[model samples]
Target: ENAELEIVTDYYKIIKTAREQLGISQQQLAQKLKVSENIVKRFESGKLKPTISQARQLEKILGIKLVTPLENNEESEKEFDDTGLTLGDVVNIKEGKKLEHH
Candidate 1:
């Protein structure tokens, strides 16, 4: 399932804010990216989901980090096992091992 990383609602704020801080217009960014101005505008309005390349483009051109790993609390444990345990699993296991010596 497309659980996460598809399009976080807060994503627009980052794009809009970072673009404004750069003092560059949407048309300017779209021009730099060689795409339609409407698409970039759509990004601010959260009407469109950009591609991985486009995301990286924003990260490079806008000097902002767009993609980030989401913090998991439950399903992760059910999906991945010790071969690739999460931070919580790793920490819990280590703590148990050390305390078990007592």
Candidate 2:
């Protein structure tokens, strides 16, 4: 039951998605963290766990609120999906020439 479609509690998935959406390359993320590109890849691929400092850094760079909610003494295993817009969505629309200005 442990592997039954449960979302990972870690921020790896979020970080990966955010980086891609923001058009920030893995190497750039590595530079921001002062770590090697391979280490950034490992963290994004869930091969390596991130420290608390790393997680906060991610939150700052990505601007996505990563909240671990508590329920029944169990922490949230899913990353909170806030409906806030991200830089990527804007850039994607701009790149596609689909953004409509008011």
Candidate 3:
């Protein structure tokens, strides 16, 4: 049997919930994240995805986990740990293949 890993994320919901819980505006979040307001808007609207560094900043500043543990198959476990990339980055990779940029 092959165990598979599943990664789930809802950027729009996560950003919206975190910002609302903090009672902060998008501008305020942008300031906290050291990003532009438009960037924050894009993130919330799913027009843009956060870079790995940006995701880390979001986790630290917002006190929330933007990505979760990848659990399922052995491949995913190794996939996550082997690369310095974030879950979002991993998602961008073609299935069962390495990044073309590689």
Candidate 4:
């Protein structure tokens, strides 16, 4: 099942090789990167892709560049606006309705 789930990510090969060459455990890398250990493990094991800034952060921290310069989709460079929205944005947004702004 795991083999079937593997889709040949562009980052996986570099991740494994870099870690092996550095002789570092995923936990050690994660601590250096200031993220959960599972993030490093899962990334190498093909669970998730890092965001653009996160990839940069990882490269700076790990001394390894996981994502290549040509790999960026550029969608991460977009500016996000968290302001203008709807009634849920004004009212009870959380599922538990714990927030009520008057």
Would you list the C-alpha lDDT of every candidate in the order shown? Answer: 0.51, 0.52, 0.49, 0.50
Best-fitting candidate, measured by lDDT? 2
Tens-place lDDT per residue, model 4, 40-82, is 6566667766677666554444344334444454232222222
Which ranges of candidate 3 are over 4 A from the true structure? 1-10, 65-102
lDDT of 2 by residue, 42-97 (tens): 65555665578766566665554322332134243433213223433544535563
What's the TM-score of every candidate structure?
0.48, 0.48, 0.47, 0.45
Q: What digit string (tens of lDDT, one per residue) describes model 1 on residues 1-102?
A: 435333564346545655565465666667656688787766555567677866555545544422223323322112222222332243464644332113
Ranked by TM-score, the better of candidates 1 and 3 is 1
- Candidate 1 vs. true structure, TM-score: 0.48
Clashes of 4: 0
Question: How good is model 3 by TM-score?
Answer: 0.47
Model 4 alpha-carbon drift over 4 Å, by segment: 1-10, 62-102
Candidates arranged by TM-score, highest first: 2, 1, 3, 4
| Tens digits of per-residue lDDT for model 3, 32-91 | 656888976665554566677766565455444233243223221212211233433554
Evaluate model 2: give its TM-score.
0.48
Backbone clash numbers for all candidates listed: 0, 0, 4, 0
Clashing pairs in 2: none
